[PDB]
Design an enzyme around this catalytic site. Sequence first.
Site, PDB file in Angstrom:
ATOM      1  CD  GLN A   1      44.533  45.177  53.341  1.00 28.65           C
ATOM      2  OE1 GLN A   1      45.758  45.173  53.258  1.00 28.65           O
ATOM      3  NE2 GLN A   1      43.784  45.021  52.273  1.00 28.65           N
TER       4      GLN A   1
ATOM      5  CG  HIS B   1      51.977  45.871  35.009  1.00 27.11           C
ATOM      6  ND1 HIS B   1      52.543  47.031  35.512  1.00 27.11           N
ATOM      7  CD2 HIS B   1      51.026  45.493  35.922  1.00 27.11           C
ATOM      8  CE1 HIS B   1      52.008  47.316  36.707  1.00 27.11           C
ATOM      9  NE2 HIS B   1      51.089  46.408  36.959  1.00 27.11           N
ATOM     10  CG  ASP B   2      47.941  47.357  35.783  1.00 30.54           C
ATOM     11  OD1 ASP B   2      47.342  46.315  35.473  1.00 30.54           O
ATOM     12  OD2 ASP B   2      48.306  47.548  36.904  1.00 30.54           O
TER      13      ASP B   2
ATOM     14  CG  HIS C   1      44.808  48.794  38.624  1.00 29.71           C
ATOM     15  ND1 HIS C   1      43.735  48.487  39.455  1.00 29.71           N
ATOM     16  CD2 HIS C   1      45.733  47.832  38.838  1.00 29.71           C
ATOM     17  CE1 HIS C   1      43.985  47.325  40.071  1.00 29.71           C
ATOM     18  NE2 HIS C   1      45.210  46.933  39.750  1.00 29.71           N
TER      19      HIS C   1
ATOM     20  CG  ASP D   1      50.628  43.946  39.868  1.00 30.84           C
ATOM     21  OD1 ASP D   1      50.553  45.241  39.774  1.00 30.84           O
ATOM     22  OD2 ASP D   1      49.811  43.194  39.384  1.00 30.84           O
TER      23      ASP D   1
ATOM     24  CG  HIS E   1      49.822  50.141  39.856  1.00 30.52           C
ATOM     25  ND1 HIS E   1      50.190  49.423  40.969  1.00 30.52           N
ATOM     26  CD2 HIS E   1      49.504  49.239  38.904  1.00 30.52           C
ATOM     27  CE1 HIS E   1      50.132  48.118  40.679  1.00 30.52           C
ATOM     28  NE2 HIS E   1      49.712  47.969  39.416  1.00 30.52           N
TER      29      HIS E   1
HETATM   30  C1  PFJ Z   1      47.089  45.177  49.831  1.00 32.36           C
HETATM   31  O1  PFJ Z   1      45.731  44.919  49.448  1.00 32.36           O
HETATM   32  C2  PFJ Z   1      45.423  44.220  48.309  1.00 32.36           C
HETATM   33  C3  PFJ Z   1      46.172  44.364  47.129  1.00 32.36           C
HETATM   34  C4  PFJ Z   1      45.757  43.733  45.933  1.00 32.36           C
HETATM   35  N1  PFJ Z   1      46.500  43.981  44.827  1.00 32.36           N
HETATM   36  C5  PFJ Z   1      46.165  43.369  43.671  1.00 32.36           C
HETATM   37  N2  PFJ Z   1      45.067  42.567  43.594  1.00 32.36           N
HETATM   38  C6  PFJ Z   1      44.316  42.306  44.714  1.00 32.36           C
HETATM   39  N3  PFJ Z   1      43.249  41.448  44.575  1.00 32.36           N
HETATM   40  C7  PFJ Z   1      43.007  40.940  43.205  1.00 32.36           C
HETATM   41  C8  PFJ Z   1      41.791  40.040  43.373  1.00 32.36           C
HETATM   42  C9  PFJ Z   1      41.803  39.638  44.824  1.00 32.36           C
HETATM   43  O2  PFJ Z   1      42.628  38.433  44.858  1.00 32.36           O
HETATM   44  C10 PFJ Z   1      42.756  37.620  45.939  1.00 32.36           C
HETATM   45  C11 PFJ Z   1      43.306  36.333  45.844  1.00 32.36           C
HETATM   46  N4  PFJ Z   1      43.349  35.622  46.991  1.00 32.36           N
HETATM   47  C12 PFJ Z   1      43.021  36.110  48.253  1.00 32.36           C
HETATM   48  C13 PFJ Z   1      43.078  35.331  49.401  1.00 32.36           C
HETATM   49  C14 PFJ Z   1      42.629  35.906  50.597  1.00 32.36           C
HETATM   50  C15 PFJ Z   1      42.088  37.221  50.670  1.00 32.36           C
HETATM   51  C16 PFJ Z   1      42.091  37.971  49.535  1.00 32.36           C
HETATM   52  C17 PFJ Z   1      42.502  37.398  48.339  1.00 32.36           C
HETATM   53  N5  PFJ Z   1      42.343  38.086  47.172  1.00 32.36           N
HETATM   54  C18 PFJ Z   1      42.321  40.903  45.563  1.00 32.36           C
HETATM   55  C19 PFJ Z   1      44.693  42.901  45.908  1.00 32.36           C
HETATM   56  C20 PFJ Z   1      43.899  42.736  47.096  1.00 32.36           C
HETATM   57  C21 PFJ Z   1      44.275  43.395  48.320  1.00 32.36           C
HETATM   58  O3  PFJ Z   1      43.718  43.254  49.627  1.00 32.36           O
HETATM   59  C22 PFJ Z   1      42.389  42.847  49.946  1.00 32.36           C
HETATM   60 MG    MG Z   2      47.012  44.414  36.304  1.00 31.01          MG
HETATM   61 ZN    ZN Z   3      49.466  46.327  38.289  1.00 31.57          ZN
END
Ligand code: PFJ
Ligand code: MG
Ligand code: ZN
Length: 305
Positions: A264, A101-102, A63, A212, A67
């Site tokens: 993933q 935004h971050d 972040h 994002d 980004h």
């Molecule tokens: C490309 O890889 C990324 C990119 C991200 N960018 C921004 N925030 C992320 N997160 C915020 C909190 C978390 O939020 C959530 C929300 N819901 C779900 C459902 C199922 C599995 C994971 C989940 N995670 C994960 C991820 C997470 C991630 O892969 C594991």
């Molecule tokens: Mg953020």
């Molecule tokens: Zn961001």
Amino acid sequence: NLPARICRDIELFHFDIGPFENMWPGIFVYMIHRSCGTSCFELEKLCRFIMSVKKNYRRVPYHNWKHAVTVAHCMYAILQNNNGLFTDLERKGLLIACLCHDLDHRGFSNSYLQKFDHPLAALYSTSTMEQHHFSQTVSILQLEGHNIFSTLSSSEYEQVLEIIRKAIIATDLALYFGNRKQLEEMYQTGSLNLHNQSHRDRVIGLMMTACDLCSVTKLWPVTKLTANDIYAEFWAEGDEMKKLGIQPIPMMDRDKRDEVPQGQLGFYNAVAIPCYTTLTQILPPTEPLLKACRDNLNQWEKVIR
Ligand SMILES: COc1cc2ncnc(N3CC[C@@H](Oc4cnc5ccccc5n4)C3)c2cc1OC
Ligand SMILES: [Mg+2]
Ligand SMILES: [Zn+2]
């Protein structure tokens, strides 16, 4: 001024902004000039503002300033392929919001700030980091010589700051599930009305999510390398949970790193695929974001095989 390769490739949704930091301000100026005309901003003031924004991002793994400019580029590409839907003021507010935004992110989630009992979590009890990011943006705009909106009327200044506040707060991914659920229902009942400000605010919130998350819409070598940086921060946060005496969830536990591909798959299925599917239904020219995301899901499915 923009190298020919970049003038061409910048229009692709899967453009990567490259490793030369000093090229990024000009990339951002080019985008906001192409979206909002060149009178949009005084070049000196906007230059001063971009350098101060850069200075208040930290050197964390994911972040960071790269980004921020990447999330702005994805918004540029969405706006360029959806000509005439958003106003000039919305276009400028949304590119500024993405760059900001971050601001001042330290690489830890709202959940860790809450468990740590950090002072920001008492100040802002929901969407903690996002309320802070918006607070930083307003503080930067308030510095001498940094008010890039000084030529707007007071009303249009208040209106663009509101576009920016809502767009930054919408990058709290906890908010995306309910936003996307409401949009999907509107889409499917044919009740979505872009003239209705509450509906328009939802579609901009989904745009902010899509931008994002956009590492998952690049080509596979970019997406895979970027995932290294995303896990670097999550694993650092998982170490800090352990040090508070709290077992972290698996995604934040470096001892569970062999389960990355399965994590993933979870993410793509629960969050990224639905996000880009809903966005493509509302803005069909965003379809390349969805196609890239499906291709990356198939790559993670290959890693598993
Ligand atoms: C490309 O890889 C990324 C990119 C991200 N960018 C921004 N925030 C992320 N997160 C915020 C909190 C978390 O939020 C959530 C929300 N819901 C779900 C459902 C199922 C599995 C994971 C989940 N995670 C994960 C991820 C997470 C991630 O892969 C594991
Ligand atoms: Mg953020
Ligand atoms: Zn961001």
